[PDB]
Protein backbone atom coordinates (compact mmCIF):
# COMPACT_ATOMS: atom_id res chain seq x y z
CA UNK A 1 0.00 0.00 0.00
CA UNK A 2 0.99 3.66 -0.27
CA UNK A 3 2.32 5.38 2.84
CA UNK A 4 1.91 9.12 3.30
CA UNK A 5 3.57 11.15 6.06
CA UNK A 6 1.33 13.35 8.19
CA UNK A 7 3.08 16.40 9.62
CA UNK A 8 1.61 17.95 12.74
CA UNK A 9 2.26 21.37 14.25
CA UNK A 10 3.63 19.68 17.37
CA UNK A 11 6.59 18.57 15.23
CA UNK A 12 5.40 15.04 14.52
CA UNK A 13 5.62 12.82 11.46
CA UNK A 14 3.01 10.07 11.50
CA UNK A 15 2.89 7.30 8.90
CA UNK A 16 -0.42 6.97 7.06
CA UNK A 17 -1.18 3.77 5.16
CA UNK A 18 -3.52 4.63 2.29
CA UNK A 19 -4.94 2.41 -0.44
CA UNK A 20 -4.62 3.47 -4.08
CA UNK A 21 -8.30 3.20 -5.04
CA UNK A 22 -9.94 4.16 -1.75
CA UNK A 23 -11.66 7.54 -1.57
CA UNK A 24 -9.72 10.01 0.57
CA UNK A 25 -13.10 10.82 2.13
CA UNK A 26 -12.84 7.63 4.17
CA UNK A 27 -9.18 8.20 5.05
CA UNK A 28 -9.84 11.76 6.23
CA UNK A 29 -12.82 10.95 8.49
CA UNK A 30 -11.24 7.84 9.99
CA UNK A 31 -8.04 9.73 10.78
CA UNK A 32 -10.03 12.42 12.59
CA UNK A 33 -11.53 9.66 14.72
CA UNK A 34 -8.04 8.38 15.53
CA UNK A 35 -7.15 11.92 16.61
CA UNK A 36 -10.21 12.05 18.83
CA UNK A 37 -12.09 14.81 17.04
CA UNK A 38 -15.05 14.96 14.60
CA UNK A 39 -14.55 15.42 10.87
CA UNK A 40 -14.39 18.87 9.21
CA UNK A 41 -12.49 20.13 12.25
CA UNK A 42 -9.13 19.67 10.56
CA UNK A 43 -8.05 20.51 7.03
CA UNK A 44 -5.67 18.33 5.05
CA UNK A 45 -3.21 20.29 2.93
CA UNK A 46 -1.34 18.80 0.00
CA UNK A 47 1.14 21.11 -1.73
CA UNK A 48 -0.84 23.99 -0.26
CA UNK A 49 -4.18 22.89 -1.68
CA UNK A 50 -6.80 21.36 0.59
CA UNK A 51 -7.56 17.70 -0.03
CA UNK A 52 -11.21 17.42 -0.97
CA UNK A 53 -13.32 14.55 0.33
CA UNK A 54 -14.09 13.52 -3.25
CA UNK A 55 -10.39 13.05 -4.04
CA UNK A 56 -8.21 9.98 -4.53
CA UNK A 57 -4.42 9.32 -4.39
CA UNK A 58 -4.58 8.66 -8.14
CA UNK A 59 -5.05 12.35 -8.85
CA UNK A 60 -3.00 15.34 -7.63
CA UNK A 61 0.12 13.20 -7.87
CA UNK A 62 0.42 11.40 -4.56
CA UNK A 63 3.50 9.23 -4.19
CA UNK A 64 5.13 7.02 -1.57
CA UNK A 65 6.75 8.86 1.35
CA UNK A 66 4.67 11.91 0.47
CA UNK A 67 4.04 14.77 2.87
CA UNK A 68 0.59 15.86 4.00
CA UNK A 69 -0.13 18.68 6.43
CA UNK A 70 -3.04 18.95 8.86
CA UNK A 71 -4.35 22.11 10.53
CA UNK A 72 -7.39 23.06 12.59
CA UNK A 73 -10.22 24.96 10.93
CA UNK A 74 -11.23 28.32 12.42
CA UNK A 75 -14.82 27.14 12.84
CA UNK A 76 -13.64 24.12 14.79
CA UNK A 77 -15.80 21.78 12.77
Amino acid sequence: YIKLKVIGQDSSEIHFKVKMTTHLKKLKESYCQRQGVPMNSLRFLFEGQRIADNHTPKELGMEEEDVIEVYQEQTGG
Binding site: K3, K17, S30
Partner: peptide, 14 residues
Protein backbone atom coordinates in the same frame (compact mmCIF):
# COMPACT_ATOMS: atom_id res chain seq x y z
CA UNK B 1 9.42 3.90 13.91
CA UNK B 2 6.23 5.95 13.94
CA UNK B 3 2.91 4.08 13.88
CA UNK B 4 1.30 3.77 10.48
CA UNK B 5 -2.39 4.57 10.42
CA UNK B 6 -3.98 1.41 9.06
CA UNK B 7 -7.15 2.44 7.29
CA UNK B 8 -6.67 0.52 4.08
CA UNK B 9 -9.68 -1.52 2.98
CA UNK B 10 -8.30 -5.00 3.63
CA UNK B 11 -8.55 -5.91 7.29
CA UNK B 12 -11.65 -5.12 9.33
CA UNK B 13 -10.16 -2.50 11.65
CA UNK B 14 -12.50 0.47 11.19
Amino acid sequence: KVDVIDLTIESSSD
